[PDB]
Ligand binder design. Structure first.
Ligand code: HEM
Length: 184
């Protein structure tokens, strides 16, 4: 039911310093649950050091106008483009307002990255079992379209970009300061 997609392949030789820097916006997303129709905006600031990823996450529920903040931490796989994180909930100033629930995790795979674009996949789990998954197209610019290389990657696993929700058309509110100040 909440089974995560197969054939999610980590990019070979992802440039760590480039990917794990700055702020990424989700320009297009595809939630593999067809009934997940609430509109969201998302941005994050992933960082890596000594084999451990530490990232700040920002969601904005467009339906409800409520934003939420998390931080995630986990080991980067030897392949250098996949990681499984545990997450807490923080407030806008970075202070923990709810501890990590040990029964939850998520696994990020960076499928492709090109110029200012990337394609990632996220598998959400509870007690090590799949509970849902989503593909996201990332860009450094919220208003930009993906590089063709990102399209090729989508096409390799029989996904088409037209199926994705386009976020630039939504009434997104972003907390950019939360992400830009991450680990400063
Ligand atoms: C635009 C793309 C995305 C959409 C539409 C989306 C959608 C959602 C939704 C609907 C929820 C549940 C919210 C609720 O319980 O009210 C959620 C939760 C969550 N998502 Fe996302 N997501 C996106 C991207 C991501 C990414 C890229 C990551 C990881 C890097 C991520 C990690 C999480 C985490 C950690 C939660 C925690 C839920 C909780 O605290 O209960 N999401 N997302």
């Amino acid at each position: 039911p909440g089974e995560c997609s197969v054939n999610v392949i980590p990019k070979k030789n992802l440039d760590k310093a480039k990917f794990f820097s700055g702020t990424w916006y989700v320009t297009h997303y595809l939630d593999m649950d067809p009934q997940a129709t609430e509109k969201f905006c998302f941005s994050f600031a992933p960082r890596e050091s000594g084999g451990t990823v530490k990232e700040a996450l920002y969601h904005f529920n467009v339906d409800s106008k409520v934003s939420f903040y998390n931080t995630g931490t986990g080991p980067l796989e030897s392949n250098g483009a996949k990681y499984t994180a545990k997450f807490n909930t923080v407030d806008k100033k970075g202070k923990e307002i709810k501890p990590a629930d040990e029964k939850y995790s998520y696994t990020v795979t960076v499928i492709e990255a090109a110029k200012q674009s990337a394609l990632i996949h996220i598998c959400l789990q509870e007690d090590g079992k799949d509970i849902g998954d989503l593909y996201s197209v990332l860009n450094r610019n919220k208003n930009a379209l993906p590089n063709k290389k990102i399209k090729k990657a989508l096409n390799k696993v029989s996904l088409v970009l037209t199926k994705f929700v386009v976020t630039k058309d939504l009434d997104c509110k972003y907390d950019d300061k939360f992400l830009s100040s991450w680990q400063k």
